[PDB]
């Protein structure tokens, strides 16, 4: 079921300064009193993070892009925030990641979900007894084709007043969804607190899906004075959540006698910080130093190739009715075209595709100076003789490639058309 909570308009996004918060452990290795340098997707220190709230009486939980990674945070004594949804279209055309947390368990499902315009979790309280809580999921309209399902113990959640900050870095590398988190008390501060907190790995989900956008899920207590369908009646406490964006950066990390991260230095943040990266020590003495220059990061990629829109007059060399004999092999010049191998792969399946000097992948990116295709017909056991350095009848007496050959060899079966009965 869905309730169209409607924000008459989105309030202008509020920017708050992240205070050097959010550095996760790179790997599960015990390192003690050793400074370790790693280059990973990282939240830049002092970034402009979001200040999105929950109730002002708008219920604003808009979708935000997931470019590389999201540093999330939450500051409420009552657990208003529970889980997140990750996806690229969020309309049941692609595979989306569902994270939802109820009092007993945490359910992670990768399915084709038709998410509602304003999803939330419904908490219903029996009158005169808050103890009786019944929960109805108002996030997904339907689910289909679930690949990965995961159920486990609930993430630490609140059940001497204190506010518990929960920070969750989400990363999608090589089809792995890495989540790092750590909960700390909050005392006498209204915004993201100072100091250093290191996030420890919790799960490593092999979701293997495309993620482009994400949205925050809120658990709203139900008020029965006004009807459920209307935005009114879903009142909850005032909770503000932070969203940051991860950009690739190189951060030195400082461990301690016991093996926990205490301090970090980002080379990009300060010229002094860059000096620390070169010396490989947090302490720097008085003087002048020369540092390695890697403060510049690429921002765009430009591609320039000459004007040739013509598909190659291959002459259907691959599809040619008659090929050359091996004693007189035909060589054909290729000039003034744009070589596309995608059509050739669709046209026929090649049994042998061995390229030397140029990799088979990213070969379509590269320009080739001059192409002389040499074509012939042999038998199967002699195909290995085509490769340079190996000998045989064909290699010694019929056709020889040099040791420094840079090119490709493409061999495919032809028993259907090149074999005659009798």
């Amino acid at each position: 079921q869905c309730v169209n909570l409607t924000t008459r308009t989105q309030l202008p996004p509020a920017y708050t300064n992240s205070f050097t918060r959010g550095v996760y452990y790179p790997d599960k290795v015990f390192r003690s009193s050793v400074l370790h340098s790693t280059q990973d997707l990282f939240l830049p220190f002092f970034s402009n993070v979001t200040w999105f709230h929950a109730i002002h009486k708008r219920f604003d939980n808009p979708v935000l892009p997931f470019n590389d990674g999201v540093y999330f945070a939450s500051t409420e004594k009552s657990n208003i925030i529970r889980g997140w949804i990750f996806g690229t279209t969020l309309d049941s055309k692609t595979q989306s990641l569902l994270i939802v947390n109820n009092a007993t368990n945490v359910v992670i499902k990768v399915c084709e979900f038709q998410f509602c315009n304003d999803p939330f979790l419904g908490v219903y309280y029996h009158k005169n007894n808050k103890s009786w809580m019944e929960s109805e999921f108002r996030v997904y309209s339907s689910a289909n084709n679930c690949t990965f399902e995961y159920v486990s113990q609930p993430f630490l959640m609140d059940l001497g007043n204190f506010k518990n900050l929960r920070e969750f870095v989400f990363k999608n590398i090589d089809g792995y969804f890495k989540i790092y988190s750590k909960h700390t008390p909050i005392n006498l501060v209204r915004d993201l607190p100072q100091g250093f907190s290191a996030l420890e790995p919790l799960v490593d989900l092999p979701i293997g899906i495309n993620i482009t956008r994400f949205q925050t899920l809120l658990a709203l207590h139900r008020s029965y004075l006004t009807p459920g369908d209307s935005s009114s009646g879903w009142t909850a406490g005032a909770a503000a959540y932070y969203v940051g964006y991860l950009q690739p950066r190189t951060f030195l990390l400082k461990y301690n006698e016991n093996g926990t991260i205490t301090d970090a230095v980002d080379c990009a943040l300060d010229p002094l910080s860059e000096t620390k990266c070169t010396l490989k020590s947090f302490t720097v003495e008085k003087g002048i130093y020369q540092t390695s220059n890697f403060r510049v990061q690429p921002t765009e990629s430009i591609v320039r190739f000459p004007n040739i829109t013509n598909l190659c007059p291959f002459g259907e060399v691959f599809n040619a009715t008659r090929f050359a004999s091996v004693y007189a092999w035909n060589r054909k010049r290729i000039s003034n075209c744009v070589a596309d191998y995608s059509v050739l792969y669709n046209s026929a399946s090649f049994s042998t595709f061995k390229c030397y000097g140029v990799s088979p992948t990213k070969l379509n990116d590269l320009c080739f100076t001059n192409v002389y295709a040499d074509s012939f017909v042999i038998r199967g056991d002699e195909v290995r003789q085509i490769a340079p350095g190996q000998t045989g009848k064909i290699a010694d007496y019929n056709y020889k490639l040099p040791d420094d050959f840079t090119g490709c060899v493409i061999a495919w079966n032809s028993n259907n058309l090149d074999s005659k009965v009798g």
Partner: antibody, heavy 126, light 109 residues
Framework: QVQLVESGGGVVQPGRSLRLSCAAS????????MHWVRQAPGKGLDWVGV????????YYADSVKGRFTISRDNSKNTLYLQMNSLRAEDTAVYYC??????????????????????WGQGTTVT | EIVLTQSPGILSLSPGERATLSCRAS???????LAWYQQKPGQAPRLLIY???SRATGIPDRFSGSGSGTDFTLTISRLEPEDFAVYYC??????????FGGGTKVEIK
């Protein structure tokens, strides 16, 4: 944009059968208690019946007895109603209306009644 | 099957004036069962007030309602030209029967 579509109208031969059905746009049709209101030509509104979220409890008004049956189809997004007879009550306009009181609202100890929020287009029953 | 009574049946007032409406119930009501409606001729009724002294979504602040026990009142602050129609009151309980009122009418003068 919520819209309930009436159907099965028109003047027929009086008695023994007539078909009414009410559709509902969107996917919020199920789990909302629904009622049927008949509009007399000159005598105001009246009641037909009520069905819950799952149809376990059903109740009918005292104006008519033993002639009306109410059922909901979840997949077709259409609620179905049948009259086993056609009495002298003619030219009555029948509306279908959705009441937001969901199962959870009466599940909670609170005793509350909301209002019939959205109504249908209407139809002619003779 | 509760005997509801609306008085007066017909009201004639100029636009911009104040009109009061009555809907009396023959039995005791827990002050959370009544609803108020406006019905223009030829169209479906529209929700105005649900429960007691609670305004529905989209209803302007000009419309008001009050009442408890067996006496209930609808009071309008100012009569718009589009607010001139017939009004009905009902009362419903989970096992209770649903009974609309005979109806009242406001008219131009």
């Amino acid at each position: 944009q919520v819209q309930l579509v009436e159907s099965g109208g028109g003047v027929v031969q009086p008695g023994r059968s007539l078909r009414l059905s009410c559709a509902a746009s969107g996917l919020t049709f199920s789990s909302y208690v629904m009622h049927w209101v008949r509009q007399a030509p000159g005598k105001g509104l009246d009641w037909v019946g009520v069905i819950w979220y799952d149809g376990s409890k059903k109740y009918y008004a005292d104006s008519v007895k033993g002639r009306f049956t109410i059922s909901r189809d979840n997949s077709k997004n259409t609620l179905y109603l049948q009259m086993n007879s056609l009495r002298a009550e003619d030219t009555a306009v029948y509306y279908c209306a959705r009441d937001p009181r969901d199962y959870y609202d009466f599940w909670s100890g609170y005793d509350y009644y909301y209002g019939l929020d959205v109504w249908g287009q209407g139809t002619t029953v003779t | 099957e509760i005997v509801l009574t609306q008085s007066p049946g017909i009201l004639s007032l100029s636009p911009g004036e104040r009109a009061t409406l009555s809907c009396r119930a023959s039995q005791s009501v827990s002050s959370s069962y009544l609803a108020w409606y406006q019905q223009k001729p030829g169209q479906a009724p529209r929700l105005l007030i649900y429960g007691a002294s609670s305004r529905a979504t989209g209803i302007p602040d000009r419309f008001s309602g009050s009442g408890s026990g067996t006496d209930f009142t609808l009071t309008i602050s100012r009569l718009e030209p589009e607010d001139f129609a017939v009004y009905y009151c009902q009362q419903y309980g989970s096992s209770g029967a649903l009974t609309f009122g005979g109806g009242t009418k406001v008219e131009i003068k």
